[PDB]
Amino acid sequence: GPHMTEDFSHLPPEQQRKRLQQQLEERSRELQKEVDQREALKKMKDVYEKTPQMGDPASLEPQIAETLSNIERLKLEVQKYEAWLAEAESRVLSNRGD
Numbered sequence: 001g002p003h004m005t006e007d008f009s010h011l012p013p014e015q016q017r018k019r020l021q022q023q024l025e026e027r028s029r030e031l032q033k034e035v036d037q038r039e040a041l042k043k044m045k046d047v048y049e050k051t052p053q054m055g056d057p058a059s060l061e062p063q064i065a066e067t068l069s070n071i072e073r074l075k076l077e078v079q080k081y082e083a084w085l086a087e088a089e090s091r092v093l094s095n096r097g098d
Contacts, residue, residue, distance in 0.1 A: 013088070021085065048060070
């Protein structure tokens, strides 16, 4: 689509669960992006500890706690969503008509 909406309420219960999903694939993506380096950080230090000519470890301190404090606010979101799917779909399931 050209433009995107704001609230996903007006959206149906079928497409509503289609929002979190995607948004989830991201909330997790940006997570695996920080995790891939999360541990690489420690390595990004030694690299400087011996070859700081390519960077400084003092510049990996505000980044580490960031990747450790982010991974939290990240995964957390990657949870609510993965749990929202049910908290949302529940609406569909609820609505039945055997």
